[PDB]
Amino acid sequence: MNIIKANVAAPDARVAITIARFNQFINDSLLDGAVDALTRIGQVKDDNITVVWVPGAYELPLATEALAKSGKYDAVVALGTVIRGGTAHFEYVAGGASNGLASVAQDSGVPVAFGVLTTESIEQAIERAGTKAGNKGAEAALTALEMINVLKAI
Amino acid sequence: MNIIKANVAAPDARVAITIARFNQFINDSLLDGAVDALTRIGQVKDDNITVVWVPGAYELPLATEALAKSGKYDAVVALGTVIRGGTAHFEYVAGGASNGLASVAQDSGVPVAFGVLTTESIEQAIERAGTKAGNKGAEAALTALEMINVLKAI
Amino acid sequence: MNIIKANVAAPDARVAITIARFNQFINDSLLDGAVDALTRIGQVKDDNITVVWVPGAYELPLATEALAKSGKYDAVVALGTVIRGGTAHFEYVAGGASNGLASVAQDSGVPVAFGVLTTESIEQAIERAGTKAGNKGAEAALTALEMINVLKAI
Amino acid sequence: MNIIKANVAAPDARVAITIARFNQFINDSLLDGAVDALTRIGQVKDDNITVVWVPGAYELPLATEALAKSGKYDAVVALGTVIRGGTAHFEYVAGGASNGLASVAQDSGVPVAFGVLTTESIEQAIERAGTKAGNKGAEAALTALEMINVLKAI
Amino acid sequence: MNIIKANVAAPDARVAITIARFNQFINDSLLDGAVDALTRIGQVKDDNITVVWVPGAYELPLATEALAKSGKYDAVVALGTVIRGGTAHFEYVAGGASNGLASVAQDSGVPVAFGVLTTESIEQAIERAGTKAGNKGAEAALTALEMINVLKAI
Amino acid sequence: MNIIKANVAAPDARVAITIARFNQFINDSLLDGAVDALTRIGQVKDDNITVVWVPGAYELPLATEALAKSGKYDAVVALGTVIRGGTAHFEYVAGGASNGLASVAQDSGVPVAFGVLTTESIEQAIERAGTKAGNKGAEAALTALEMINVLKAI
């Protein structure tokens, strides 16, 4: 029985990271995590890393499509933060950028990390971006990498 | 009146099983169920079974597309576990991987088992992965098989 | 005054372990315990251990009768898990498989370990199958062994 | 270490199904499940299936004894439904027909499926005979078959 | 300004993993995590991994001392689980095995991963050994590795 | 991948058991357990067992140091009982005799079993010294033994 388990190192790969500046104070750690994990752990040279900055998490898709489409990159790490509020705007943003980044994947064949925090409080976000419960940004990068070699393994 | 009822044996197909390592402690039984049911019940030789390991349940799709697309396999058994928490991350993961694996089906013609536990507690998950209420992993495999022969029957 | 105290080592005797796959996620540790204790502690060679897998705990008896009857084995370790639910099905299963395995004993002269968890929750079962309160599976094996030498001592 | 895991297919075996007509409205699905699972999954020819109809679940034993005793059949699937009521009649029926079918097993060596619903409501029974929580009738048949090959494996 | 950041790969150094069998049902995943992360992520060959099995978490120290002392190994991953109960036994065990493994470090110069779950429920432990909140076992190994190269970097 | 699993038999090695007479009515079973398990299970000859009686559990350490130090013994089983009361005397005793026996270990290389009940009631102690929840005294001896062979295995 043949099994495919893939590691998170991939010294070559050119990875593209996209980020929303809205909720910067939180998305900024997400990048730090991502990049660190990318180089340090994934053996990626820091010039095979390009970082595209779109305004809001709602724009993450188009960005990560023009990227993956381009072809130059082996994976895109999508980094954003959406914290619910007064209205169900959160609903449509978080969603249109989940279903978004998701469709960009299935249409490009390029793996894309859903590094988008969809929470309820700054409290929860600060938890999931460096403190108590990890740093999804980095995670997103590792899962990015891994997926690179996984797809490669077929 | 002609009726199509198909059995779960198919000691001929090559099945591909994909799995998220996140929630391993629970997804691991899912695999055990799947594989057992696959061979034991489905008469499948254990070298026509390949098992691809992606990080998270969010990645199950791309994996199961590269697989089905490939052509080598007659069906893909998707195995993952998503248990709700503080935020509606659960929402987007579970969803983007349900609608995901769903689309991979209708676009590849390759049957795909939705063996993804979408629950509320480790309590519920442990129920649905071996104990009280069956072992969806195995089920997923049987439904996988059956569907193989069902499709074949047209 | 002559006293009979018997140890748990018995590197010769061939032990047969029977197991219900229902509640696999719990019964599986029961087996691990059983086997470890059997070899490691009981000095049993791992080819004098045969493991029969019946569907449900209700079937444990017939299995462990055909075994003991057979004669080849020196003791049978019965391993199953029954957790109560909506109806008193638990009642009849647990019972018909307690009184069952019991009768197989008195009619075969072959010791049989009642390694069947009869509980109320997955919580309680997980306690009694490796965690907080031991690992009845193993226990069942040791009591199995000991009994071998105890009977022998008469 | 030698392990016995047995499949649910068994072409040449002749299975005898017994059924109580009391609670027909519920037992009837039990039969449908049983038979379907018997042929479809177990590869059993529908003329090696005989179906004996006794009045009440209390009678299931004698029926399933004269059957197994007879010898012609490789296993008996016992199908009935007992739903508690005003008195503890349920107690004695369900019991005398659990311990019953149990004894018929250990004395005939012929596996017998305990496909008898012992519940509290039509609600629970309808759950356990086709809807929400499976279709014990079918299950009873599969466990029946499996046991056939399991015993055979010794 | 010179900075020391170290990666988690180290395909040459021989790691020793120690484990308490008490709370097996939980410590077993701890091992699975550890090992996977060790090889898969850390590039460690699976014969440079030795696994010592002590009875209880209280014994973890002496084991991990005889190991590190020995010299053959570059790091020890300590894996155990202690879940509080009726008395403050938990107190002394968890403690004497924290301060324990700690002292073994500072006296051997060999890094040691504190992969010992000190919780309040099987619920919490199952969270911290594969499911909801990661798999400390794996973590312990990565921190183990990293520390190898960190120390090396001085 | 090389694994070290050790059994509890060790008919050579000379074990020294130490015991507090305070709480005799409870510690006495602790000894019975210990000794039984030692000989019966561990194959230890009853003249390779010496039993030192110190007044209180606070004294257990010095006793078990002069012993291990001595060299004649292969392991020390420490047996005492401390049940909390009006003041936090319990605190300092239980502690100074946990940390105590712990240090004697790491400084002598001689395994030492922490067979000291640290409870809240005679109720709890009677549970943990023969009745409901085992007989820690015996346990302490087995873990003693096992550790002997475990250390030996390096």
Q: Is the dihedral of CA C27, C29, C33, C34 positive or negative?
A: positive
Q: CA Rg, chain B, in Å?
A: 15
Q: CA Rg, chain D, in Å?
A: 15
- List all residues 6 or more positions away from B98 whose beta carbon is below 8 Å from its beta carbon: B114, B116, B118
Q: Is E75 helix (H, G, I), strand (E, B) or coil?
A: strand
Q: Is C14 annotated as a binding residue?
A: no
Q: CA torsion B58→B60→B61→B64, rounded to 10°?
A: 170
Query: Of C32, C33, C131, which is closest to E26 when you measure between CB atoms?
Result: C131
Environment class of B116 (CB within 10 Å of its CB; exposed 0-12, middle 13-18, buried 19+): buried
Structure tokens at C44: 């049993």
* F64 min Cα distance to partner chain E (Å): 16
Question: E126 and B125: CB-CB below 8 Å?
Answer: no
Question: F41 and C7: CB-CB below 8 Å?
Answer: yes
Q: How many separate helices (H) and strands (E) can be counted in chain E? A: 5, 4
Question: E50 and F4: CB-CB below 8 Å?
Answer: yes
Instruction: Find which of D41, D145, D149 to mutate to test the B interface (most B CBs within 10 Å of its CB).
Output: D41
Q: Is F47 helix (H, G, I), strand (E, B) or coil?
A: coil
Q: Is C146 a catalytic residue?
A: no
- List all residues 6 or more positions away from D147 whose beta carbon is below 8 Å from its beta carbon: C54, C55, C59, C62, C63, D75, D111, D113
Q: Which residues of F touch C135 (CB under 8 A)?
A: none
Q: Which residues of D touch C73 (CB under 8 A)?
A: none
* Continuous segment of H or E residues that includes residue F109: none
Question: E24 and C130: CB-CB below 8 Å?
Answer: yes
Could you say which of D7, D89, D120, D122 is catalytic? D89
Phi, psi of F73, deg, nearest 5: -100, 150
Q: CA torsion C124→C89→C31→F128, rounded to 10°?
A: 30
Of B1, B13, B51, B36, nearest to B151 (Cα)?
B13
The set of catalytic residues of A is 89
Structure tokens at B14: 């090559």
Q: CA torsion D95→D98→D104→D109, rounded to 10°?
A: -150
F131 to chain C, any CB pair closer than 8 A? The answer is no
Look up tokens 């691991």; give the residue. B28
Structure tokens at F57: 């559990």
Look up tokens 């006794």; give the residue. D54
> How far is residue E35's CA from residue E17's CA, in Å, rounded to a whole number?
9
Environment class of E1 (CB within 10 Å of its CB; exposed 0-12, middle 13-18, buried 19+): exposed
A102 to chain E, any CB pair closer than 8 A? The answer is no
3-state SS of chain C is: CCCCCCCCCCCCCCEEEEEECCCHHHHHHHHHHHHHHHHHHCCCCCCCEEEEEECCCCCHHHHHHHHHHHCCCCEEEEEEEEECCCCCHHHHHHHHHHHHHHHHHHHHCCCEEEEEEEECCHHHHHHCECCCCCEHHHHHHHHHHHHHHHHHCC
* Continuous segment of H or E residues that includes residue A50: strand A49-54
Look up tokens 């209205």; give the residue. A87
E81 to chain B, any CB pair closer than 8 A? The answer is no
CATH number at residue B108: 3.40.50.960
State the structure-solving technique: X-ray
A131 to chain E, any CB pair closer than 8 A? The answer is no
Of A106, E94, F109, A96, nearest to B62 (Cα)?
A106
Please report the resolution in angstroms: 3.5
* E24 min Cα distance to partner chain C (Å): 5
Per-position b or e across A105-143, b if 16+ CB within 10 A of its CB:
bbebebbbbbbbbbbeeeebbbbbbbeebebbbbbbbbb
Q: At residue B142, what is the residue type?
A: L
* Half-sphere exposure at residue F4, Cβ-oriented, CA atoms within 13 angstroms: 25
* E66 min Cα distance to partner chain B (Å): 31
> How far is residue E97's CA from residue E114's CA, in Å, rounded to a whole number?
9
> How far is residue B81's CA from residue B97's CA, in Å, rounded to a whole number?
11
Q: CA torsion C65→C69→C71→C74, rounded to 10°?
A: 40
Is the CB of residue F45 less than 8 Å from the CB of residue F39?
Answer: yes
Q: Is the dihedral of CA F39, F42, F47, F49 positive or negative?
A: negative
Look up tokens 């102690």; give the residue. F125
Host domain of residue B113: 1-154
> How far is residue E126's CA from residue E29's CA, in Å, rounded to a whole number?
9
Cα first-last separation, chain E: 15
Is the CB of residue D35 less than 8 Å from the CB of residue D71?
Answer: no
Residues followed by a break in chain A, C–N over 2.5 Å?
Answer: none
3-state SS of F75-108 is: EEEEEEEEECCCCCHHHHHHHHHHHHHHHHHHHH
Per-position b or e across E43-74, b if 16+ CB within 10 A of its CB:
bbeeebbbbbbbbbbbbbbbbbbbbbeeeebb
* Continuous segment of H or E residues that includes residue E103: helix E89-108
Is the CB of residue F137 less than 8 Å from the CB of residue F33?
Answer: yes
The number of distinct structural domains making up chain F is 1
Of A58, A139, D80, nearest to C89 (Cα)?
D80
> How far is residue C97's CA from residue D35's CA, in Å, rounded to a whole number?
26
> How far is residue D18's CA from residue D25's CA, in Å, rounded to a whole number?
16
> How far is residue F100's CA from residue F59's CA, in Å, rounded to a whole number?
9
Q: Which residues of E touch C31 (CB under 8 A)?
A: none
> How far is residue C133's CA from residue C126's CA, in Å, rounded to a whole number?
9
Strand partners, D4: C52
E5 to chain B, any CB pair closer than 8 A? The answer is no
Interchain contact B/F (3 or more Cβ pairs less than 8 Å) = no
- List all residues 6 or more positions away from F125 whose beta carbon is below 8 Å from its beta carbon: F23, F26, F81, F83, F117, F119
Phi, psi of D118, deg, nearest 5: -115, 95
